[PDB]
Every structure is written in structure tokens, then in C-alpha cells.
Amino acid sequence: MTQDELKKAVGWAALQYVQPGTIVGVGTGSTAAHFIDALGTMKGQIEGAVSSSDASTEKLKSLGIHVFDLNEVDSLGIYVDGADEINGHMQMIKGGGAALTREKIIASVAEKFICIADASKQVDILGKFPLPVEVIPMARSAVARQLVKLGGRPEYRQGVVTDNGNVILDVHGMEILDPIAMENAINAIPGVVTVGLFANRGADVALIGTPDGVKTIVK
Amino acid sequence: MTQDELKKAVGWAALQYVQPGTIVGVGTGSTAAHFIDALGTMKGQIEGAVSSSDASTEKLKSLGIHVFDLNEVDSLGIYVDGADEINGHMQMIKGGGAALTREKIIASVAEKFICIADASKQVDILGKFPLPVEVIPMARSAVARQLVKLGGRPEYRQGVVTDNGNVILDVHGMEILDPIAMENAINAIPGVVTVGLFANRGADVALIGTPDGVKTIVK
């Protein structure tokens, strides 16, 4: 259909993963917005949700869904979110838009990560979409230099300031052939807060909206 | 002599590493305070310093030493600082006091890390001194749980808030037999900003004040 319905079919497709009587972790972004819409449908069948962004929270709140803080929760059965890119090994790049840090923390608490996305987010090798990296301001230059040394071209998003008061460096031109080693290498750089690479903890399930329907990838 | 003179002898001992015409990275804490004092001595022989804490900055500034921000510098020849503990492999634990994050970032920019400390900081296996971990507030509980899973007993420093607006978890009871693998394991935890383990990048030189003088460990 149209890219946006490909984002709706996949939003509702994920509703089959929501289990009655549980708390749901929800992502942020247009694709995720459709899942929230679908989730509103089960208001009354679930306990609530842990939200990754104010936008999402404000929308969940508006559908009569109780939103728990991440510190009011011990664990999470599922976390449903989109991705900027996802390779064949379920490893993803996230953060292009909003909530890079919150999204990654909630995903670490979630047992199962359900990625919902249209076919355009599928890639062979992560890297085409610039890899976002949140860093402590005082270390921007330091980290910029390490990223160069790691093979990418850091481009500071002037004007932007995370809710945690940090800056963002979008790394271009990298051909991330081994996402796990790359996530590790950048997480090792002092000054780095979050790398938009969900490789050690990738998607467990992926709902991909294809014009022929919605393919489901697992494991 | 007295523990404090053991901290003064070692402060001045490090002055032999300061090279004329360069910028110096200075640490924070009582031991480092003695190095600053000694460094004031070469005011006029060096270009200035990159400071790891306001206290240090205010003191360097007071000795007529120009202080450059970390983003006004490309690299650093040396960084002189103390440590809460240091093992035989030059790996250390730092952050018990102040500036855990800034200290680690400056040390990453510095070519040579010079550790100055009295003999009490020397240990066989890191862990006795609680391992500090700076974390994004929203993930305190999350990280607390992972640290438990890694074998330590996280104890949140209630009341404290980093200059980066974060909280601190001091991890007790760990017997950090492999500091590199442990620094890697904790840096991998979303929510973690900085782990007070300088293992992938440890001390290159260690000036240890012993009653018999000042031993110098290298490599």
C-alpha cells in the first residue's frame, strides 16, 4: 500500500503480542504511534505501559492507559518500537529521531523486543543511516576524534540538547560490519552516554510491513 | 613519614614528568592538590593545564596557570591524578570522591597517565574500595539490578547529584579479578554513564609514596 499504511498494518500487527494483565513498554515515533493507537483498543485488558517519550506518554495518557515510570517497574515482558535500520541479524540502529537513551534503557528491562517497521528500514549492513551517539558536552571533541579513528564522520547536531542535557553526534559513512564489536568500541569511549546500536540486545521479533502483507522474523 | 607527606613527596615527584612548553592535565583530590602546588612552581615554563574539577581549576587559576577547556585541546601529553585503588597491572578504581566522569574523559585524551598515590592505594585485586558508577537517574533501578547480577552490592549515594545531573551507585563486595572484562560489562549497561574502572586505559606510570621513598612503576 502506501508507506504509512505499511506503518499501520505493522502497528496493529504487534497488538497480537500484547498479553492481557501485563505492563507494555512502548516506543516513540510515527510507526510506534500506530501501535499506541492499537493498544488503546485493549485499554482495560492490560495494566498499563512504560513510555519511552513524552509524546508517547501524552498519547497513552490520552487513551486512558496508565503510564508507569521506569522506576515503578521490576521488568517488562515486551517493548514495541520501530528502528532507523535493522539488519538480518536483528541488530538495529535507533535514535535518529527522539529518545535514544530512554528507548535503550527500557529495552534493556524488557524481556522481548518487538521491532515494528516498514520494509524500508531493512538493510544488509548497518551504517547507511547515520549512527547517533549521545555524549556529555565537555567530551564532544574527544569523542568526535575517537569516532573518526573508528572510521566514521561525526557530525554534531548543532542546536540540539538531549533531555539529559547532552549533545548528539551523528556518525556517517561507517560500514558497521560487526555491530556488536562497534557498540562495544563506542560504549568504551569516556564521554559517551548512549550509542544508537542495539546489537548486544537486538530485536527478538520483527514485524515488517511489506506490500505483500507483514512478514514476521524471529530469533 | 606521615600519610600526608607521603602525598606531598609523590606530588612533587611527578613534577619531573611535566615538560616545558606543554599543556598539563591535572587531577583532583588531596594527593593531586600537592601536584598542583608543585606545578605552580613551573608557572611560566608551561602553557597551562586542562583541569578535572572546579576545585583544581580554582586552584590552578590562583597560581597564575591558564586553564584550557577540554574542547580547546586536541590531545594531552600527560594527565596526573591519584586513585582510590591501583593493582599490579596498573588498572585502577577512581571516582570515590569527585569528578569521576571528567577525570576519565581527560585521561582518554592524555597520552600518558601518571598515577600519584601513597602506598595505601596499592591492592592485589580491585574491589575492596566500592566501585563508583554514574548513571542516568531514570535507570538507577535498572542498573542496580544488573550490578547485582554481576556480583556486587549497589548502594545509591542518596543526596548526591553529579554536575551532569546524574546519580551515583557505589558497588561493594565485588572481587574484580578481571578489571577489563568488568569495565566492559558495566559500560554495556544502558543508563550507565561512567564506571570508575580505568582498566582498558590504566596508569602508564605510577609514583607511589613509600616510607622508604617513592617507588616508580612503569609499563
HEC string of chain A?
Answer: CCHHHHHHHHHHHHHHHCCCCCEEEECCCHHHHHHHHHHHCCECCECEEEECCHHHHHHHHCCCCCEECHHHCCCEEEEEECCCEECCCCCEECCCCCCHHHHHHHHHHEEEEEEEEEHHHECCCECCCCEEEEECHHHHHHHHHHHHHCCCEEEECCCCCCCCCCEEEEEECCCECCHHHHHHHHHCCCCEEEECEECCCCCCEEEEEECCEEEEEEC
**Chain B contacts of A99, Cβ < 8 Å?**
none
Helix (H) / strand (E) containing B215: strand B213-218
Whole-Å CA distances, A192 to A82, A111, B165: 23, 25, 15
CB neighbourhood size of B67 (10 A): 17
Name the one residue in this structure whose C-alpha cell is 601536584: B35
What nine digits make up the cell of A64? 486512558
Q: Residues of B annotated in the binding site for substrate, as ranges? A: 28-31, 81-84, 94-97, 121
What nine digits make up the cell of A201? 540486545
- A26 by Cβ neighbours in 10 Å (0-12 / 13-18 / 19+) ranks as buried
A105, A138, A139 member nearest B190 (Cβ): A105
Whole-angstrom Cα distance, residue A136 to residue B193? 9
- A60 by Cβ neighbours in 10 Å (0-12 / 13-18 / 19+) ranks as buried
DSSP-based three-state secondary structure for B143: helix
Give this entry's resolution in angstroms: 2.5
CA B116 to chain A, closest CA, distance in angstroms equals 21
Q: What is the CA radius of gyration of chain B?
A: 17
**Chain A contacts of B165, Cβ < 8 Å?**
164-165
**Chain A contact present for B141, CB below 8 A:** yes
Q: What would the DSSP string read from start to end of B156-209?
A: E-TT---TTS-EEEEEES--BS-HHHHHHHHHTSTTEEEESEE-SS--SEEEEE
Q: What burial letters (b/e) apply to B7-45, b meaning 16+ CB within 10 Å?
A: bbbbbbbbeebbeeeebbbbbbbebbbbbbebbeeeeee
What nine digits make up the cell of B45? 615554563
Closest-CA residue in chain A for B108? Answer: A190
Whole-angstrom Cα distance, residue A116 to residue A93? 13
Contact between A141 and B107 using a beta-carbon 8 Å cutoff: no
Sheet order of strands, B85-86 included: B85-86, B92-93, B197-198
The CATH architecture assigned to A125-196 reads 2-Layer Sandwich (3.30)
Closest-CA residue in chain B for A139? Answer: B105
**Chain A contacts of B191, Cβ < 8 Å?**
101, 105, 108
Q: What burial letters (b/e) apply to B195-211, b meaning 16+ CB within 10 Å?
A: bbbbbebbbbbbbbbee
Whole-angstrom Cα distance, residue A135 to residue B193? 9
Helix (H) / strand (E) containing B219: none
Whole-angstrom Cα distance, residue A133 to residue A94? 10
Whole-Å CA distances, B132 to A62, B147, B174: 40, 11, 12
Is A165 assigned to a binding site? no
From B155, B41, B163, select the one nearest B102 (Cα to Cα). B163
Q: Which amino acid does the sequence have at B59?
A: K
- The sign of the CA dihedral B59, B21, B91, B10 is negative
Closest-CA residue in chain A for B192? Answer: A193
- Map B40-102 to HEC letters: HCCECCECEEEECCHHHHHHHHHCCCCEECHHHCCCEEEEEECCCEECCCCCEECCCCCCHHH
From B209, B3, B213, select the one nearest B116 (Cα to Cα). B209
B2-124+197-219 and B125-196 in the same fold: no
Helix (H) / strand (E) containing B118: strand B110-118
Closest-CA residue in chain B for A71? Answer: B141
**Broken C–N links (> 2.5 Å) in chain A, after residues:** none
Bridge partners of A204?
none
Compute φ and ψ for B207, nearest 5 degrees.
-105, 110
**Chain A contacts of B141, Cβ < 8 Å?**
70-71
User: Which technique was used to obtain these atomic coordinates?
Assistant: X-ray
CB neighbourhood size of A115 (10 A): 27
Contact A63, A43 (CB under 8 A): yes
**Chain A contact present for B102, CB below 8 A:** yes
From B219, B203, B213, select the one nearest B119 (Cα to Cα). B213
Whole-Å CA distances, A186 to A122, A143, A215, B216: 23, 9, 32, 33
The CATH architecture assigned to A2-124+197-219 reads 3-Layer(aba) Sandwich (3.40)
End-to-end CA separation in angstroms for chain B: 27
Whole-angstrom Cα distance, residue A209 to residue B157? 47
Most distant CA atoms of chain B, gap in Å: 52
Contact B86, B206 (CB under 8 A): yes
Whole-angstrom Cα distance, residue B192 to residue B97? 18
Name the one residue in this structure whose C-alpha cell is 535507533: A94
What nine digits make up the cell of B140? 538507577
Whole-Å CA distances, B118 to A37, B5, B32, B152: 62, 9, 11, 27
Contact between A193 and B141 using a beta-carbon 8 Å cutoff: no
Domain ranges of chain B: 2-124+197-219, 125-196
Q: Which amino acid does the sequence have at A162?
A: T
Contact between B190 and A107 using a beta-carbon 8 Å cutoff: yes
Contact A71, A16 (CB under 8 A): no
